[PDB]
Protein backbone atom coordinates (compact mmCIF):
# COMPACT_ATOMS: atom_id res chain seq x y z
CA UNK A 1 0.00 0.00 0.00
CA UNK A 2 1.46 3.37 -1.00
CA UNK A 3 0.72 5.35 2.20
CA UNK A 4 1.65 8.97 2.88
CA UNK A 5 2.82 10.99 5.91
CA UNK A 6 0.78 13.97 4.45
CA UNK A 7 -2.61 13.69 6.32
CA UNK A 8 -4.00 17.03 5.09
CA UNK A 9 -0.69 18.75 6.06
CA UNK A 10 -0.12 20.49 2.62
CA UNK A 11 -3.81 20.95 1.66
CA UNK A 12 -5.22 21.79 -1.78
CA UNK A 13 -4.83 18.12 -2.90
CA UNK A 14 -8.57 17.26 -3.05
CA UNK A 15 -9.26 13.93 -1.34
CA UNK A 16 -5.63 12.59 -1.63
CA UNK A 17 -5.16 12.63 2.19
CA UNK A 18 -8.63 11.10 2.74
CA UNK A 19 -7.62 8.29 0.29
CA UNK A 20 -4.18 7.61 1.87
CA UNK A 21 -5.33 7.87 5.51
CA UNK A 22 -8.24 5.42 4.77
CA UNK A 23 -5.72 2.73 3.53
CA UNK A 24 -4.47 2.41 7.18
CA UNK A 25 -7.71 0.56 8.17
CA UNK A 26 -6.21 -2.49 6.32
CA UNK A 27 -3.70 -2.95 9.17
CA UNK A 28 -6.62 -3.65 11.57
CA UNK A 29 -9.05 -5.36 9.08
CA UNK A 30 -6.28 -8.02 8.53
CA UNK A 31 -6.77 -9.23 12.16
CA UNK A 32 -10.58 -8.68 12.26
CA UNK A 33 -11.98 -10.00 8.91
CA UNK A 34 -11.24 -13.46 7.29
CA UNK A 35 -8.81 -12.67 4.36
CA UNK A 36 -5.47 -12.89 6.26
CA UNK A 37 -4.55 -16.18 4.49
CA UNK A 38 -5.04 -14.74 0.95
CA UNK A 39 -3.53 -11.24 1.42
CA UNK A 40 -0.80 -9.67 3.55
CA UNK A 41 -0.73 -5.90 4.14
CA UNK A 42 2.67 -4.17 3.86
CA UNK A 43 2.19 -0.41 4.29
CA UNK A 44 4.98 1.73 2.88
CA UNK A 45 4.95 5.34 4.14
CA UNK A 46 6.69 6.74 1.01
CA UNK A 47 8.69 9.93 1.59
CA UNK A 48 9.45 12.91 -0.64
CA UNK A 49 10.46 11.39 -4.00
CA UNK A 50 11.80 13.81 -6.65
CA UNK A 51 10.76 13.64 -10.38
CA UNK A 52 7.35 11.78 -10.11
CA UNK A 53 3.92 12.78 -11.61
CA UNK A 54 2.61 13.96 -8.16
CA UNK A 55 5.77 15.82 -6.80
CA UNK A 56 7.52 17.31 -9.97
CA UNK A 57 6.45 20.93 -9.06
CA UNK A 58 8.17 20.62 -5.61
CA UNK A 59 11.77 19.80 -6.82
CA UNK A 60 13.47 23.26 -6.47
CA UNK A 61 12.81 23.34 -2.66
CA UNK A 62 14.18 19.75 -2.11
CA UNK A 63 17.78 21.11 -1.57
CA UNK A 64 16.35 23.52 1.07
CA UNK A 65 14.62 20.70 3.02
CA UNK A 66 17.76 18.45 2.93
CA UNK A 67 19.67 21.16 5.02
CA UNK A 68 17.58 20.20 8.13
CA UNK A 69 19.26 16.70 8.18
CA UNK A 70 16.15 15.38 6.29
CA UNK A 71 16.31 13.09 3.21
CA UNK A 72 14.53 13.44 -0.15
CA UNK A 73 14.74 10.41 -2.46
CA UNK A 74 15.47 9.87 -6.14
CA UNK A 75 12.98 7.49 -7.83
CA UNK A 76 15.76 4.78 -8.00
CA UNK A 77 16.40 5.19 -4.22
CA UNK A 78 12.67 5.00 -3.29
CA UNK A 79 12.21 1.99 -5.66
CA UNK A 80 15.18 0.23 -3.98
CA UNK A 81 13.61 0.93 -0.54
CA UNK A 82 10.23 -0.58 -1.71
CA UNK A 83 11.95 -3.61 -3.38
CA UNK A 84 13.42 -4.21 0.08
CA UNK A 85 9.86 -5.07 1.23
CA UNK A 86 9.55 -7.99 -1.32
CA UNK A 87 12.83 -9.66 -0.02
CA UNK A 88 12.18 -13.04 1.75
CA UNK A 89 12.70 -11.71 5.36
CA UNK A 90 10.05 -8.90 5.14
CA UNK A 91 7.73 -11.28 3.16
CA UNK A 92 7.97 -13.87 6.07
CA UNK A 93 7.27 -10.91 8.43
CA UNK A 94 4.12 -9.64 6.58
CA UNK A 95 2.62 -13.19 6.95
CA UNK A 96 2.94 -13.01 10.81
CA UNK A 97 1.42 -9.49 11.17
CA UNK A 98 0.96 -6.39 8.94
CA UNK A 99 4.22 -4.47 8.27
CA UNK A 100 4.39 -0.66 8.39
CA UNK A 101 7.58 0.57 6.71
CA UNK A 102 8.51 4.24 7.20
CA UNK A 103 10.49 5.40 4.12
CA UNK A 104 9.85 9.04 5.09
CA UNK A 105 13.55 10.10 5.38
CA UNK A 106 12.91 11.92 8.71
CA UNK A 107 10.33 14.35 7.21
CA UNK A 108 7.82 13.76 10.11
CA UNK A 109 10.34 15.44 12.57
CA UNK A 110 10.17 18.85 10.71
CA UNK A 111 7.59 20.92 12.71
CA UNK A 112 4.86 22.72 10.65
CA UNK A 113 6.17 21.50 7.24
CA UNK A 114 3.69 23.41 4.96
CA UNK A 115 4.86 26.85 6.25
CA UNK A 116 8.58 25.77 6.02
CA UNK A 117 7.87 24.65 2.37
CA UNK A 118 5.94 27.90 1.39
CA UNK A 119 8.76 29.96 3.06
CA UNK A 120 11.40 28.04 0.96
CA UNK A 121 9.43 28.59 -2.30
CA UNK A 122 8.87 32.37 -1.58
CA UNK A 123 12.64 32.95 -0.75
CA UNK A 124 13.43 31.39 -4.22
CA UNK A 125 10.68 32.82 -6.53
CA UNK A 126 11.45 36.25 -4.86
CA UNK A 127 15.27 36.04 -5.37
CA UNK A 128 14.57 35.02 -9.02
CA UNK A 129 12.01 37.78 -9.98
CA UNK A 130 14.15 40.47 -8.09
CA UNK A 131 17.46 39.51 -9.88
CA UNK A 132 15.50 39.25 -13.21
CA UNK A 133 14.11 42.80 -12.64
CA UNK A 134 17.43 44.40 -11.38
CA UNK A 135 19.32 42.83 -14.39
CA UNK A 136 16.70 44.01 -17.03
CA UNK A 137 16.75 47.60 -15.48
CA UNK A 138 20.63 47.72 -15.28
CA UNK A 139 20.56 46.71 -19.02
CA UNK A 140 17.99 49.45 -19.96
CA UNK A 141 20.09 52.05 -17.95
CA UNK A 142 23.41 50.91 -19.61
CA UNK A 143 21.68 51.12 -23.11
CA UNK A 144 20.28 54.69 -22.48
CA UNK A 145 23.62 56.15 -21.15
Amino acid sequence: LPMSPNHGTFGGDGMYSESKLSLETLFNRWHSESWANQLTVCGAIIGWTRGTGLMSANNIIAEGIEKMGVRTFSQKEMAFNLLGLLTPEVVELCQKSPVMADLNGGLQFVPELKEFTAKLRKELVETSEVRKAVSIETALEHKVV
Binding site: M68, G69, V70, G106, F109, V110
Partner: peptide, 6 residues
Amino acid sequence: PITKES
Protein backbone atom coordinates in the same frame (compact mmCIF):
# COMPACT_ATOMS: atom_id res chain seq x y z
CA PRO B 1 20.48 14.97 14.30
CA ILE B 2 16.71 15.80 13.92
CA THR B 3 15.63 12.07 14.24
CA LYS B 4 17.19 11.81 17.80
CA GLU B 5 14.30 11.42 20.34
CA SER B 6 14.81 12.07 24.16
